[PDB]
């Protein structure tokens, strides 16, 4: 028969890279599709809707593993 | 008795180990849990004949390095996948 | 386990207050006593504490772990908080309901001057 169909996305991964000086609201990890690979806990709580993680203060990205579940968190720390 | 004459390893790594196997010798390691492990090389044909002797694994062996007798026991043997020869032995201090 | 269920109830508001950087007035309630702790937003050091097991509070009360005891502990913790000079704390239920001794402690802190 026939089985040749596919969808499209054009980004699916992080943009902030833990040295990245992201200001204001830059999407640190857009189209993660989900709050579980990365959580936002440094600059308050990101993860608005479609779980896009974004900065809330002008500063450097921070990647870290916290919690009892060994979950990965994106933080924003000041320069 | 099972005495093996062994030499210490000047260089470690995959290239050095393949150079040993090209020169018809093979690497080995001795560890005891009380002091630092010692990396040695062995004469492959002699240690092969001691493999073919079936009592190689049960009893206590004697490795001579620099004139020093070390009482060991064969823990595991890394064998070549499709040839009779053998690549690596680890010895636990007995 | 009742303590584990209480921690599961408390955890959502505890992490929400941790993310806001809020100084938490937490309350612990037992059948015998009630405890109040104003804790700095880092969560590691306790700024102000007032307990029913403290003898100065406990000697004035007919029964420890009463609603009157909860009001006395809330008044005491708000008095020591205003003596320390800190204000604008956020109240943590710590898994309990806002009812009875917990509500009485928070109402006494609000009356004595600790604003939420």
């Amino acid at each position: 028969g026939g089985s040749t169909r596919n969808g499209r996305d054009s980004e699916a991964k992080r943009l902030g890279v833990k040295r990245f000086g992201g200001e204001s609201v830059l999407a640190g990890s857009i189209i993660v599709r989900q709050r579980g690979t990365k959580f936002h806990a440094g600059a308050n709580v990101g993860c608005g809707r479609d779980h896009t993680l974004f900065a809330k203060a002008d500063g450097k990205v921070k990647f870290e593993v916290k919690g009892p579940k060994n979950r990965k968190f994106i933080s924003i720390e000041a320069e | 008795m099972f005495t093996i004459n062994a030499e210490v390893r000047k260089e470690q790594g995959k290239g050095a180990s393949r150079r040993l196997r090209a020169a018809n010798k093979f690497p080995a390691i001795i560890y005891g849990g009380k002091e630092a492990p010692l990396a040695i090389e062995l004469d492959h044909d002699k240690v092969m004949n001691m493999q073919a002797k079936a009592e190689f694994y049960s009893e206590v062996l004697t490795i001579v390095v620099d004139g020093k007798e070390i009482k060991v026991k064969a823990q595991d043997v890394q064998r070549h996948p499709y040839k009779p020869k053998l690549q690596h032995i680890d010895f636990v201090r007995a | 386990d009742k303590k584990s269920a209480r921690i599961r109830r408390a955890t959502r508001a505890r992490r929400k207050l941790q993310e806001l950087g809020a100084t938490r007035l937490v309350v612990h309630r037992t059948p015998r006593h009630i405890y109040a702790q104003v804790i700095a937003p880092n969560g590691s050091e306790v700024l102000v504490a007032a307990s029913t097991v403290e003898k100065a509070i406990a000697e004035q009360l007919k029964y420890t772990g009463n609603k009157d005891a909860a009001a006395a502990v809330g008044k005491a913790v708000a008095e020591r908080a205003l003596e320390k000079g800190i204000k604008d704390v956020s109240f943590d239920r710590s898994g309990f309901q806002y009812h009875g001794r917990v509500q009485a402690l928070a109402d006494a802190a609000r009356e004595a001057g600790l604003q939420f």
């Binding site: 028969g1 | 694994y57 043997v77 064998r79 996948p81 499709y82 | -």
Partner: protein, 136 residues
């Protein structure tokens, strides 16, 4: 025989054959037919070598088959052009790397095992060797 009862997916990618095999030791039996060289072992070749073994040992002792044909191989029919989808699944192979013990044997004398392994090796495409159980 030796086609799997179910598969998660009907067809696979072609892939490439790996470096060296896992399962080089003689584990269950006392003698083994180790592989020296790469190739794909068809289920029909596996069955033919098994029958040669079993009749050579006269259905005595016990024989282990350590490999399984879990990869479907598709072939296009005759006089059809390229494209128009992937072809129909025709037969099943096991990817063999050097050092893979293919068969195992126990309960027989060693020379009878060698004769049975030689008659199986005459049916297999890849070069094989006789191996014996070794303690480590």
């Amino acid at each position: 025989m030796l086609q799997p009862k179910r598969t998660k997916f009907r067809k696979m990618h072609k892939g490439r054959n790996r470096g060296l095999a896992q399962g080089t030791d003689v584990s269950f039996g006392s003698f083994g037919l180790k592989a020296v060289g790469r190739g794909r072992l068809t289920a029909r070749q596996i069955e033919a070598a098994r029958r040669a073994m079993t009749r050579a040992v006269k259905r005595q002792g016990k024989i282990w088959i350590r490999v399984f044909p879990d990869k479907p191989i598709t072939e296009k029919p005759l006089a059809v052009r390229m494209g128009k989808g992937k072809g129909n699944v025709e037969y099943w192979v096991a990817l063999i790397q050097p050092g893979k013990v293919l068969y195992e044997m126990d309960g027989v004398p060693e020379e009878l095992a060698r004769e049975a392994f030689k008659l199986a090796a005459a049916k297999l495409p890849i070069k094989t060797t006789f191996v014996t159980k070794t303690v480590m």
